[PDB]
Design a binder for these strands. Structure first.
Lengths: 64, 140, 67, 143, 143, 140, 68, 63
DNA sequence: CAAATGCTATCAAAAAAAAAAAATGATAGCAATCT
DNA sequence: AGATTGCTATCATTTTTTTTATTTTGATAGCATTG
């Protein structure tokens, strides 16, 4: 999906640009990661059910 | 600070998964559950040892895209320090009559370095290494 | 400035829409904020104001040209 | 990254600092701003040439104990490689009328190697150096 | 670089240590030799298992105060990446005949990542892992 | 050690090179002779400002394959530390009536940094900057 | 163990040929020695003999196997 | 421009191979560079003359 | 002598350049919402 | 009812990724000539 951020404070932009490069990422990828991490937090994964699902989907397995 | 053992993490994936273990895994804060590289290596091998077919391929897909990414950053490595712990744990038990499989010792020493609670079906080995343990096949 | 974030997973995207809604604002307002806070956190020192103070401390100085 | 020339970093310290400039300096991430050893030479000489008294002393401390340390690790030297760029930045300017002075060449040259942008009040010269410049005194528009 | 497997690093410490092996270890430059965390573990446990006495105390000291320190920074952990490699090195060998023991897979896998050469007396396994191997018990011919 | 000011290191190249300066440069142990990036910058610029041609092309060739490689590793950078020295050197001399060209200042400072004897035909400046000087136009 | 060196500066060659003649060696022998010399310099420690000593100090050990 | 080194102590060979990779260059470049450094240390350049000639070689210049 | 040298060679892998494909960074243009 | 917002799009770069040449190593093989 695409998203346009306008009227972004100049400084806030300089700062993000900094984080991105200082980590070897393009600014765009940086923001993309940031928003990604936030989603990650907001979410509470159901580990048990998550797998048992993937297992019921592939007819179940036994990885020893 | 919970460290899943191979047999635990892989329980839900089984044919007749134990619903008690699934429920337990479903009661955890993912940002607090770890894995040993040794354990991830065992899972990855389990997948890799499957006969070629759609099955092996979808599983691999998930394993790398869905399952494993959830522990990214928390897959503990077996290094020098931990190797010293391993030696203690195993040499100790062994010289007191309780055997500890290398496989187990690795997880054990790891858990032991960060004071973590090993979650497993075979608690004997870990009680022996003096490591907090939790058998998810039970309650409480 | 402006920036377009292409190839943003619908998951993350929906997460951010949700966040914004819950927070009572627009998504563009939410991202603008999320970024702002981060930026605020990196802004350890403010060079201008920092130097300004010094100026104000000695009542300003005009340094010889030299070059 | 941004390389601050002498006149820009001098502004805030003046009697009536230029509002627009200070604000600009304020919108930056310190770790992104750098200084050429040359510019540092100048700032220190500019200080040293003052008349002896309180002002000078205070400013000296501020300079060594406050300003410069913020740039530790980011004060760029004029080393052998930079020299090559230098020789070409100036030569190329002379064969295009617009002359560039040694000092400006040093700074420019430095900036160019590390592919940076010079923030100066006198963009006049630097453009002829084939290097990105920015006048914090002016405004910013469209592209 | 070379990765020493347990059994080689042990050879010299033994009663009548194979001379050919000790000769080869001396023809080496320390900074080039590495150990796997797995291997250190094995060594560390092999010591711990000796009956309590003088021999075990000294060996334990020399072991931790002399030997090991010499590989500081050159002791390779079995991290997540290495695991992926391990997964293939083993599944591969199996669907090809010669099966590999996990321990040996850890070492191989480790070595492979950094494309190192495994020095072991038991080469019979590693070669099946597509990793370069060398037996210091044997003679060098090389073409 | 010895740092060659720009004018000395470039004399031999001049049309009718002064023999006293050439002969002295010949008595030196290359491994003890240095150059300042500043000086190296003007040398290179000197070559750049020549009309493209055999002369310029060869001079350049020789300057990069035959001359500078001789100083590889001994071409002193103008850095922060030096900048401070430069500031003291010029401030003192200047607030005492002896103008020190910023040009010469960069060298005197480089020299004053590592305790070197500067070689130059402009002895006057350097004496004022408190740096060992030597005029290769004379003898001894 | 043998190795070739092509595109060797012609000046460097003579310099080495010279140094060899100065000493009573052949050029190859001189290379071998200027090489062997720096090599011995890299040799900070001899792992083999090192571990051996440790072995002799304790009369030698025989660690258990421990490995499936 | 070409030299062959035989009967070379496989170990001295190791030492070199090592210094080679550590500096990111082929073993050969290494020998070449080593020999090159030797020659330079055996040489005494006369800075004055060496320039004085490059000078007369191009009709003289000034910087 | 046979062993050692000094040169030229082979010869199969490793170790700059030319082309092709992504992203990135800057806005630009609207229809549908909120103020 | 003018500003904001959500979605797409244009476009001149950067940045990667992939192909296609060229060079260089490795390693050791001929051959005519001194400890």
């Amino acid at each position: 999906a695409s998203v346009v951020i306008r009227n972004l404070s100049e400084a806030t932009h300089n700062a993000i640009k900094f984080r991105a490069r200082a980590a070897g990422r393009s600014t765009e990828a940086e923001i993309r990661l940031i928003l990604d991490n936030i989603a990650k937090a907001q979410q509470t994964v159901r580990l048990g059910s998550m797998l048992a699902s993937i297992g019921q989907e592939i007819g179940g397995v036994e990885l020893e | 600070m919970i460290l899943l053992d191979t047999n635990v993490i892989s329980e839900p994936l089984r044919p007749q998964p134990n619903e008690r273990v699934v429920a337990w895994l479903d009661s955890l804060i993912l940002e607090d559950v770890y894995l040993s590289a040794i354990t991830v290596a065992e899972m990855r091998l389990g997948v890799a040892l499957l006969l070629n077919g759609k099955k092996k391929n979808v599983l691999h897909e998930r394993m790398e895209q869905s399952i494993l990414p959830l522990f990214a950053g928390r897959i503990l490595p077996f290094d020098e320090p931990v190797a010293a712990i391993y030696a203690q744990i195993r040499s100790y038990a062994k010289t007191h009559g309780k055997e500890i499989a290398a496989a187990d010792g690795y997880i054990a020493a790891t858990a032991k370095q960060h004071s973590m609670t090993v979650a497993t079906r075979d608690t004997g080995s870990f009680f022996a290494a003096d490591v907090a343990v939790f058998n998810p096949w039970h309650l409480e």
